[PDB]
Design a protein around this ligand. Structure first.
Ligand SMILES: *[C@@H]1O[C@H](CO)[C@@H](O[C@@H]2O[C@H](CO)[C@@H](O[C@@H]3O[C@H](CO[C@H]4O[C@H](CO)[C@@H](O)[C@H](O)[C@@H]4O)[C@@H](O)[C@H](O[C@H]4O[C@H](CO)[C@@H](O)[C@H](O)[C@@H]4O)[C@@H]3O)[C@H](O)[C@H]2NC(C)=O)[C@H](O)[C@H]1NC(C)=O
Ligand SMILES: *[C@@H]1O[C@H](CO)[C@@H](O)[C@H](O)[C@H]1NC(C)=O
Lengths: 70, 70, 70
């Protein structure tokens, strides 16, 4: 009934940013992003100043569709 | 970045975000002693995104279509 | 501190805290026109506390062993 998007060792912020091990989530819509406890990062280290706020904002948006701008 | 200190001012008609980089040492993650702070800006219809950067900018490649749902 | 401006970057493997001293006059408390703003850092097992600074540091002397209880 709900469009479930699996974690597959990916976080929502990593899929937002474009992790090379998370490139399969590009332009993907969901109704529930199920994050896994085995998730990690394999890119440049980063530190979001408001991580919970950004994560809740993207989860409430519920889409990863991205339009390139020149 | 060819200058001693950068400065980033990403602002709209309804908000303003000025962030200065903090040069220093960090514990190494994946053999990287540097960090990246991730910020977000939301542009309403009729609003204008303006980006200033003397340096140290991790520039965006476009926009994510934020919406409201379940 | 022999320098015109200080800078403290107390960082760990999952968070960073960069502060800047604010030189200026303040109302006197106990014949002291200066203040010391107190920050804290929590280091999880496996993380590394990297305190790097160039001045204006009120250095720690150890850890306080926070726990969970009643
Ligand atoms: C920028 O603006 C701020 C305004 O807040 C100024 O700060 C004030 O500066 C004055 C002048 O230094 C301070 O006044 C001093 O107060 C001290 C504490 O007073 C208490 O203790 C004494 C006993 O020691 C009691 O008698 C008193 O009732 C208080 O309980 C005093 O000890 C100082 O006395 C010194 O000067 C007198 C001469 O006036 C001598 O006779 C003494 O021996 C002693 O050397 C002095 O009176 C004041 O406290 C500051 N804070 C405030 C909130 O007013 C900055 O100075 C100013 N800076 C610049 C660069 O302009
Ligand atoms: C991460 O997930 C992929 C597929 O989901 C898997 O092939 C890979 O082995 C996982 N990484 C680790 C370190 O197990």
């Amino acid at each position: 009934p709900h469009q479930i998007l699996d974690g597959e060792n990916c976080t929502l912020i990593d899929a937002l940013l474009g992790d090379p091990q998370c490139d399969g989530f590009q332009n993907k819509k969901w109704d529930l992003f199920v994050e896994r406890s085995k998730a990690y990062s394999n890119c440049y280290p980063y530190d979001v100043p408001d991580y919970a706020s950004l994560r809740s904002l993207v989860a409430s948006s519920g889409t990863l569709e991205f339009n390139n701008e020149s | 970045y060819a200058q001693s200190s950068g400065r980033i001012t990403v602002s709209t008609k309804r908000s303003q975000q000025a962030v200065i980089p903090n040069i220093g040492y960090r514990p190494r993650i994946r053999n990287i002693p540097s960090r990246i702070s991730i910020y977000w800006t939301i542009v309403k219809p009729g609003d204008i995104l303006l980006i200033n950067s003397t340096g140290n900018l991790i520039a965006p490649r476009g926009y994510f279509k934020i919406r409201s749902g379940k």
